[PDB]
Structure formats: structure tokens, C-alpha cells
Ligand binder design. Structure first.
Ligand code: NAI
Ligand code: FMN
Ligand code: SF4
Ligand code: SF4
Ligand code: SF4
Ligand code: FES
Ligand code: FES
Ligand code: K
Lengths: 230, 430, 213, 44
């Protein structure tokens, strides 16, 4: 047997080689907070929300990009893990605009949910926030780039699954904007799925925009009939 | 040995550092370079790596990692992939110009070091990532590369040993973050200079996915001298696990800012009073010294008296060695303005890939601008310290830590000046 | 100051641009400098090559560089926008950069900057109306021991004084080319008060070698 | 003899815009054949 045993919160579990920390933590039925990791996209490791602490190791590792080894003990509820989560949440909410009432992601927002669950309760940022120029990328995806957090799921989706290679990250530093650098109309057969993978309200559905709110919607499962994929 | 320094001209690694002799092949070969290279290449990579490991040579980039172990990381059998050696000649750190002097005045020493290092780890070819702004330096380096190529020293059957070795020079595009080894690897491959995550290490996946080792100019150009003179010759200098000779770039409010070679564990006071020509206005005018460029915290006069300029004594003085870049500030300076400009420089050189640096460096810039103006509350100063603790250790690369360290040092050493400035502003404006 | 592009009559994909055949051979050599299967690694100098063709990069070298290397154009857009050397706006014939980093402001680079401003009669980032000089500020350029300094086109001018920089300006306006070197007593990096080290001549080959080598 | 009062890096004043590129063009004839990955691009 090539499988190795690792430890999470003092509990042993048996994982495969090449398995990251987050996959083992999901194997023991816990969810490490994340913004840029996706189970169907490549690992970017830039949001730094998934930082956890391995014991006897004075540096936090990214659980979405660190392979495990035999004998490792992972503390997912220690003090420094919560401190790192609060710091990353504060940095993410430092430049986020006060647009929650007028944003369609409200009620199903990842940023709000993990800010309540793992972030702090007040903002120490007393300066003026940034403002990003909006873009027009088609008649289906309403775009407001001021609310983006540079998670780069746009980029990986456009370069790996859709394979259109139109989206990119222009500029350097905090002024870097996720866009196409020109008035490029991003149209493809799988464009609207980016609205699924945006954790913030930067990309929204244009026909659905300013129409409803997720907490008052009943969900009924069904099958598509427009195409024969089912 | 206790007194360290006073290095003779017979032990200096880089002759013609000042450009007073010929830098071409006929001048370099007359100064001792390109001598008995064939026997060095023929003796064995294991012997070369052992000679480097016994010498105690450490990281000349500023990281402080031992060079022998890191070079021996790739001493493994291949899996069908080529192996690569890359020389980091970006040198975007403020206060640092030694690699510029090496690539402008001793290019053939760099080429021989590339050949020796590539033999040591079995590299197929060598890539030199020159800085974009160093156009004349890159042209001189390529002239020396062509002169070494036409002499049969490198290329097919390099130095008559049957071992092929190719060398390349690639120019940058004006980015300090490209100096980071993983961002340099990404920049060579044709993407933006955005660093990778370790693991996987460059020894496993580097440029083009090949096993690749990235080393500084100053730690590559000394390798043929390391093999020739011997490991114990380099181990004779400095303290234990602090061997070698270092190039120091002294600048700031100094009578004669200059680049000079010296021993590792020389006291800072002796070096700055001997080679630099002394602090302007005497010793009593000195206010602070940054010992490693923009990446290290500053130290005041109370710590600058009896500090040894090696890794252990500087890490004992809650700062770092850095790239041995001595930036000197006297009493006629606005120190908070200097740290604010350093933080603004860090803001203008940050790739923005990972969140804590991308937000906290801008936040630190705003806070330090308000501190230079003085428009804040005193407790916010302590709050700024906490912001540093939310950056140091939570980043992809070490630029965020390199921005958090000078702010921590400035606060820890000159909180009274900061608080008196802002309370003076509050009194005189409200 | 903008990281997005808008279609202007002076900057559009329909703007004519092409490479000379000698530049095509240079691009071929640059491509051959890299391993097969990694042609995109040639996208860094070749685009810079296009800058040396024009002095600035409109969106016609971007598409051409993307076309001649089989890469998507958005990669070239990312490379051009991420790096500060690639001018996407038409700069003057002599691009002047002044270092205002801490080891350069320590040696009063602000006086030199104000001298350039009162000589050329422009502001920070502004272009002279004869399309000759462009004055911006950048980070450390590697001449800290010879601070203060400027960089004009591809030439370094170190250890400058206000008289020195105004002489450089009024000699550049006359059509000649100045001397890219420090203007103080020292030549490259030695102390101005004589050689503190390397006064002895070098010892040549076969010195201090070990047995068995 | 021995000279120590002259700067020997006087060639760098005489460099044009295309000196690096034409130097690379001239030096390309001395280089080894590059290794192959099996495909002309990772997008293939
Ligand atoms: N030389 C210059 O111009 C500048 C230097 N620096 C300095 O550079 C340093 C930051 O750069 P790094 O290379 O990231 O420093 P360091 O953390 O990474 O590591 C030094 C070397 O050891 C390797 N390494 C690190 N951890 C390893 C491990 N667990 N196993 C195997 N190999 C490992 C790295 O790949 C690297 O080659 C700082 O000390 C900073 O002060 C910063 C700015 C400019
Ligand atoms: C932001 C950043 C910039 C860096 N810039 C340089 C550089 O310009 N030159 C350099 O030699 N090392 C630079 N380094 C350090 C490298 O990561 C690495 O330590 C060095 O290239 C090789 O180290 P060595 O001396 O042990 O060979 C930088 C590191 C960081 C984090
Ligand atoms: S995306 Fe931003 S504005 Fe919208 S609900 Fe979330 S935090 Fe609020
Ligand atoms: S717009 Fe949304 S999905 Fe796209 S990079 Fe920003 S946060 Fe990620
Ligand atoms: S710390 Fe800053 S410069 Fe380094 S990877 Fe993160 S965003 Fe880039
Ligand atoms: S989920 Fe790991 S860094 Fe984003
Ligand atoms: S700080 Fe100006 S050249 Fe380095
Ligand atoms: K969304």
C-alpha cells in the first residue's frame, strides 16, 4: 500500500500520495475557506485564505497547494490560523466597495459569508479605497470590475475549459485589472458559467440583474431539454 | 583570529573591479582567469561540489542559504529532461550595484563561473538574466561571450574536455520583482514576472519544467577561484559558517560612496571609516544605517558601534545582512520621509499576484504618507505594526516581508520621533 | 497611467507596422535561442525589438508579435502592460528618467529634478512640445554609489550636478550625443579620495593554486 | 608596463541601438541544437 497516514486535529486519516492538505481536510468532512481554489480548475494559490498551520513548523502553508507528507499534523483551528484568516479577510475587505444592497451576489456571496464566519467585525481602514474602470464584455455578463478581488478564476476558466484565451490581468500592483485590454466582446458557448465561479458580485447575469434575491427563491431540480446532453 | 578586515590585494577575488585594466579575454587571462579550467572540468562534479561545500560559501543574493548544499540539490540522475543553470543579474535592490560592476568589468570571470557551475550540477546550458537597464553591461557581457566562444573555451567541446556547454543572455523589461528566482523563471518562459509556489522547488520544476538552479552573479563568479585556491583558502576568512569576501556598496550621506571588497566579519564602523571616507559631518552626525538595502531594517548609532557585518551578528541585531548594501543617513535627514519613499518604491515594484502584499503595501503607503504629514492618532502607529504582522509570513514571495521589515525597524527604533511629529502637527493645526 | 486601451485614429489594429528583413533574421535568432516547444519564451525581447523599431508600442506590434510566435494576443497585452519599459504612448526622442529612490534622494536628486523642470519648462511626465524630451521618474537604476543620476535613452549619466544636467540638456538640443559616464573625479565606482584598495598590480595566472589541480 | 590611472571601459560609449541584437544574430551560429519536447507548443 502506497497510501500514507496524516493527522488532522489529532485524528489519523489515510490519504494518497500527491494529495493536498485541503483534500484531506475535505476527506475528514471539514471545509477550509477559499477564494481561488476550485476542484475543476488549476491551482493558483494567490488568495492566501486557505492558510493553515502544520504543527512544529513556524510558517503557515497554503492548504490548496501544499502536498502532505507522512507524520504531518494539521491544526485547522489554532490561534495563528485564525489570525491569518482574519488578516487575509481584512486585506480583501480593505478596498472592497460598499455595494452590498445594490449587488446581485448579496445573500449568496462567498465574501460576506466567510467574513461573518472567519473574519473580524470592524474595519481599521481609514483611507480612501480604489476605483476600477468598468468594462463591457458582452450582452450576457454584466461587468462591474470595482468589486473584483483578483481571484483569477476568470483567467483559468477562459484558458483551460472554454479555451478562448481572451481574458487577462493588465497592470502591476494594486492597480491590476482583470480584463481584455481592449473592447473585446467575449462570446463563447460556455461564457455564462463564469457567473457561477465569481465569488463576488463583479460578474452577474444581465437578464437576472436587479430582478430577485436568492433567499426568497425556491429551488426545483429539473433536466435541460434544449440540447440532448440531458 | 579575532580581528577581521584589512584584506590585502593578494586575497581580493575581483581584480580590475575599478575598471583600470582590460576587461576582454586577453586582459582577464592575464589576471589569472581561464587558467587550468580543463582539469577542473575533468576532475568531477562530485569533487567540485565537495570543494564548494567545504569552503562554506553562502548565499550572496541576500537569502543566506548555503551555496554548496543548494548546488548539490540537483546532483541527481536525470529522468530524460535537460538541466539548467540560471544566473540572476537583475539587481533591482536599492543600494546594491556590485553585480553591475562584476558584469561590466569582469565578464569572463562570470562566464568561467557559469561553466564551472554547469559542470558541477550537470547543466546543459546557462542563462544570464541581465537587467534591462544595463544595456552597455549586457553588450560587454555578450562581447566577452563571443570572445570566449571564438577561443574554444565554451560551446562544443568546451575547454577541450568533451563536455558541451552553451551560454545565453536574456534582457529584462524593467521589473524589480523579476529578481525573485521563480518570477525570473516565469519571466524567461515568456509570462509576467509573477512568482511560483515552493514546493515544487526549482530543483524539480524550473524553467520550461526542467530542473533548474538559479544563483547570483557574485556566488557564480567566485566558483573558479573557489576550485583553484581551495576550500580552506575561502574558509580562512570570517567567523565560523560566515566565510568569504564580500563586495560592499556604501552610499547615502557619505563623503565617498563606493564599492569595495572586504572580509566578511569586518566591523561596520571600521569599513565605513576606512573605505567610505567617513560619515559627513563626523561620526556624531550619523543617525541611522540600513545594512542591506531596502530589504533590511535600519539600525541607529547605538547599534552601529560594535556590529560585525556578517549573517549571525546582524541577525542578532534584529535586522538582516541583505546584499551588503550600506545606506547611511545622517542627522540632516527626514528619516520618516526616507522610509515613506522606500515603501512607495515597494508599492511601485510589486507584482500584485497574491492578496496580502497587494493590499497591505498600498495600505502601508497611505499610513506612512499620513505619518510623514502627521495626520493620524498615536495608537494607529501600533496598528501599523499589526499590519506588518499580517504581511510577514503570509505571502507567495518575500517582497511582502521585505516591505514589512523596514516599517517594523523604523517603528521599533524611532517611535518617539514619529509621535512627536504628529502631536506637533495636531497642536499647530488644530 | 491607464492600463486599458481605447481605439484612437493614432492607435488601432489598423495602424500600419512591419518588421524589416534584418529584424526578421534577428527575431529568428531570438526564437532559435530557446528550446523547441517554447516559442512563447521569445515574446520578451522581440516585442522590445519592436520598440526599437518605433520608439513606442501601439496596438500593431502587439498583434504582429502575437502572430509571428503563435501565441494569443492577450499574452502580449499582459506582457506589455505588466512591464514598465514598454511605452504604449508615443514618448519624445530622448526619454529621461530620474531616480528618486532613498539612496538617490539622500544626495539631493530633487535639486536636479527641479533644474530639469526649470530648464525644459515642463512638468513630471509631460512631453516637450518639440517632441524631443520626456521626463518621468523611476526606481533604483543600479548607480547608488554614484547617486544622483539620470538615464537618457540607453545611456547612464551619474554623479550629476544641476550645471552638469543643464549642460547635458543644452548639448543634447544641439544634435550631439553626450558621454555616458560619471561626471565626477572618479571613473566608475572608486572612492574620490584615491584608491583605498587594489593599489597593488594583479598577480596573474598560477597564483595560490592547490596541489592536484 | 603597468597602467592604473585610465578607465579601460571606453567602448561602451560607441554602442548603437541594435548592438545586442546583432551580436546575438552573429553568436547564433556557435550554439548547440536545442532539445525538443515532442510538440511545437503546449497548446498543440
Ligand atoms: N540580491 C538581491 O538583489 C535581493 C535579495 N533579497 C533577499 O532575498 C531573500 C528572499 O529570496 P529567496 O530566494 O526566496 O530566499 P530563501 O527563503 O528562499 O531561500 C534561498 C534559496 O534556498 C532555496 N530554498 C528555500 N527553502 C528551501 C527548502 N525548504 N528546501 C530547499 N531549498 C529551499 C530557495 O529556492 C532559494 O534558492 C531575502 O533574504 C531578501 O533579503 C531581496 C531583495 C533583493
Ligand atoms: C523580491 C525579491 C527580489 C530579488 N531580487 C534579486 C536580485 O535582483 N538579484 C539577486 O541576485 N537575487 C535577488 N533575490 C534573491 C533570490 O530569490 C535568490 O536568493 C538569489 O537569486 C540567489 O540566491 P543565492 O545567492 O543563494 O544564489 C530577490 C528576492 C526577492 C524576494
Ligand atoms: S460581492 Fe461585494 S458588494 Fe456584492 S454582496 Fe459580496 S461583499 Fe457585498
Ligand atoms: S471577476 Fe470574479 S471570477 Fe473574475 S477574477 Fe474577479 S473575483 Fe475572480
Ligand atoms: S508578495 Fe507581492 S510581489 Fe511577492 S508574489 Fe505576492 S503580490 Fe507578488
Ligand atoms: S485557496 Fe489556497 S491560496 Fe486561495
Ligand atoms: S537608488 Fe537610485 S540608482 Fe539605486
Ligand atoms: K457571481
Amino acid at each position: 500500500s502506497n497510501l500514507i497516514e496524516v493527522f488532522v486535529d489529532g485524528q489519523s486519516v489515510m490519504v494518497e500520495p500527491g494529495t493536498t492538505v485541503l483534500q484531506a481536510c475535505e476527506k475528514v468532512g471539514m471545509q477550509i475557506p477559499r477564494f481561488c481554489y476550485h476542484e475543476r480548475l488549476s491551482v493558483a494559490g494567490n488568495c492566501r485564505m486557505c492558510l493553515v498551520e502544520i504543527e512544529k513548523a513556524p510558517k503557515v502553508v497554503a492548504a490548496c497547494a501544499m502536498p502532505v507528507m507522512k507524520g504531518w499534523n494539521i491544526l485547522t483551528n489554532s490561534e495563528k490560523t485564525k489570525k491569518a484568516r482574519e488578516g487575509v479577510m481584512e486585506f480583501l475587505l480593505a478596498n472592497h466597495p460598499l455595494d452590498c444592497p445594490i449587488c446581485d451576489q448579496g445573500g449568496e456571496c462567498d465574501l460576506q459569508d466567510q467574513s461573518m464566519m472567519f473574519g473580524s467585525d470592524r474595519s481599521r481602514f481609514l483611507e480612501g479605497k480604489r476605483a476600477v474602470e468598468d468594462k463591457n464584455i458582452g450582452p450576457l455578463v454584466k461587468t462591474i470590475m470595482t468589486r473584483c478581488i483578483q481571484c483569477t478564476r476568470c483567467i483559468r476558466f477562459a484558458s483551460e475549459i472554454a479555451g478562448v484565451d481572451d481574458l487577462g490581468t493588465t497592470g502591476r500592483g494594486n492597480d491590476m485589472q482583470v480584463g481584455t485590454y481592449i473592447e473585446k466582446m467575449f462570446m463563447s458557448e460556455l461564457s455564462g458559467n463564469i457567473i457561477d465561479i465569481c465569488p463576488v458580485g463583479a460578474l452577474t447575469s444581465k437578464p437576472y440583474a436587479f430582478t430577485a434575491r436568492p433567499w426568497e427563491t425556491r429551488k426545483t431540480e429539473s433536466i435541460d431539454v434544449m440540447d440532448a446532453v440531458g | 583570529k579575532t580581528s577581521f578586515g584589512s584584506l590585502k590585494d593578494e586575497d581580493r577575488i575581483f581584480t580590475n573591479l575599478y575598471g583600470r585594466h582590460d576587461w576582454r579575454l586577453k586582459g582577464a587571462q592575464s589576471r589569472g582567469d581561464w587558467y587550468k579550467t580543463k582539469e577542473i572540468l575533468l576532475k568531477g562534479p562530485d569533487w567540485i561540489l565537495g570543494e564548494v561545500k567545504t569552503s562554506g560559501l553562502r548565499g550572496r543574493g541576500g537569502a543566506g542559504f548555503p551555496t554548496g548544499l543548494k548546488w548539490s540539490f540537483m546532483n541527481k540522475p536525470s529522468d530524460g529532461r535537460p538541466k539548467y543553470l540560471v544566473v540572476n543579474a537583475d539587481e533591482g535592490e536599492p543600494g546594491t550595484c556590485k553585480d553591475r560592476e562584476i558584469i561590466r568589468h569582469d565578464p569572463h570571470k562570470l562566464v568561467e563561473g557559469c561553466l564551472v557551475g554547469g559542470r558541477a550540477m550537470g547543466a546543459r546550458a546557462a542563462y544570464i538574466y541581465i537587467r534591462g537597464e544595463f544595456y552597455n553591461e549586457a553588450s560587454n557581457l555578450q562581447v566577452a561571450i563571443r570572445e570566449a566562444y571564438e577561443a574554444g573555451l565554451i560551446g562544443k567541446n568546451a575547454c577541450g574536455s568533451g563536455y558541451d556547454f552553451d551560454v545565453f543572455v536574456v534582457r529584462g523589461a524593467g521589473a524589480y520583482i523579476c529578481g525573485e528566482e521563480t518570477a525570473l523563471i516565469e519571466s524567461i518562459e515568456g509570462k509576467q514576472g509573477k512568482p511560483r509556489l515552493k514546493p515544487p522547488f526549482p530543483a524539480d520544476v524550473g524553467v520550461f519544467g526542467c530542473p533548474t538552479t538559479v544563483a547570483n552573479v557574485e556566488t557564480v563568479a567566485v566558483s573558479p577561484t573557489i576550485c583553484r585556491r581551495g576550500g580552506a583558502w575561502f574558509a580562512s576568512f570570517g567567523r565560523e559558517r560566515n566565510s568569504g569576501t564580500k563586495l560592499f556598496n556604501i552610499s547615502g550621506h557619505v563623503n565617498n560612496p563606493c564599492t569595495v571588497e572586504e572580509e566578511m566579519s569586518v566591523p561596520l564602523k571600521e569599513l565605513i571609516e576606512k573605505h567610505a571616507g567617513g560619515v559627513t559631518g563626523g561620526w556624531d552626525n550619523l543617525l541611522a544605517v540600513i545594512p542591506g538595502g531596502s530589504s533590511t531594517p535600519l539600525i541607529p548609532k547605538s547599534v552601529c558601534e560594535t556590529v560585525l557585518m556578517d549573517f549571525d551578528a546582524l541577525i542578532q541585531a534584529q535586522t538582516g545582512l541583505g546584499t551588503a548594501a550600506v545606506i547611511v543617513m545622517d542627522r540632516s535627514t527626514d528619516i520618516v520621509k526616507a522610509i515613506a519613499r522606500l515603501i512607495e518604491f515597494y508599492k511601485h515594484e510589486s507584482c500584485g499576484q497574491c492578496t496580502p502584499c497587494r493590499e497591505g503595501v498600498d495600505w502601508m503607503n497611505k499610513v506612512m504618507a499620513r505619518f510623514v504629514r502627521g495626520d493620524a492618532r498615536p495608537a494607529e502607529i501600533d496598528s501599523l505594526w499589526e499590519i506588518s504582522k499580517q504581511i510577514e509570513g503570509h505571502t507567495i514571495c518575500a517582497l511582502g516581508d521585505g516591505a514589512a521589515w523596514p516599517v517594523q525597524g523604523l517603528i521599533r527604533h524611532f517611535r518617539p520621533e514619529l509621535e512627536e511629529r504628529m502631536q506637533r502637527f495636531a497642536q499647530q493645526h488644530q | 497611467a491607464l492600463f486599458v486601451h481605447r481605439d484612437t485614429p493614432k492607435n488601432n489594429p489598423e495602424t500600419p507596422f512591419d518588421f524589416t528583413p534584418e529584424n526578421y533574421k534577428r527575431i529568428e535568432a531570438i526564437v532559435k535561442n530557446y528550446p523547441e516547444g517554447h516559442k512563447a519564451a521569445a515574446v520578451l525581447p522581440v516585442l522590445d525589438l519592436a520598440q526599437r523599431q518605433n520608439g513606442w508600442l501601439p496596438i500593431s506590434a502587439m498583434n504582429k508579435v502575437a502572430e509571428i510566435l503563435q501565441v494569443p494576443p492577450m499574452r502580449v497585452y499582459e506582457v506589455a502592460t505588466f512591464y514598465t519599459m514598454y511605452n504604449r504612448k508615443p514618448v519624445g526622442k530622448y526619454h529621461i528618467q530620474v531616480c528618486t529612490t532613498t539612496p538617490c534622494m539622500l544626495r539631493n536628486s530633487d535639486s536636479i529634478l527641479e533644474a530639469i523642470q526649470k530648464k525644459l519648462g515642463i512638468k513630471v511626465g509631460e512631453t516637450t512640445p518639440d517632441k524631443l524630451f520626456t521626463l518621468i521618474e523611476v526606481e533604483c537604476l543600479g548607480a547608488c554609489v554614484n547617486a544622483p543620476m539620470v538615464q537618457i535613452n540607453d545611456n547612464y549619466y551619474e554623479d550629476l550636478t544641476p550645471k552638469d544636467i543643464e549642460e547635458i540638456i543644452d548639448e543634447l538640443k544641439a544634435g550631439k550625443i553626450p558621454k555616458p559616464g560619471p561626471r565626477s573625479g572618479r571613473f566608475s565606482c572608486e572612492p574620490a579620495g584615491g584608491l583605498t584598495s587594489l593599489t597593488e598590480p594583479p598577480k596573474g595566472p598560477g597564483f595560490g593554486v592547490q596541489a592536484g589541480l | 608596463p603597468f597602467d592604473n590611472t585610465t578607465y579601460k571601459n571606453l567602448q561602451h560609449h560607441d554602442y548603437s541601438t541594435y548592438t545586442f541584437l546583432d551580436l546575438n544574430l552573429d553568436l547564433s551560429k556557435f550554439r548547440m541544437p536545442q532539445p525538443s519536447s515532442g510538440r511545437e507548443s503546449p497548446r498543440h
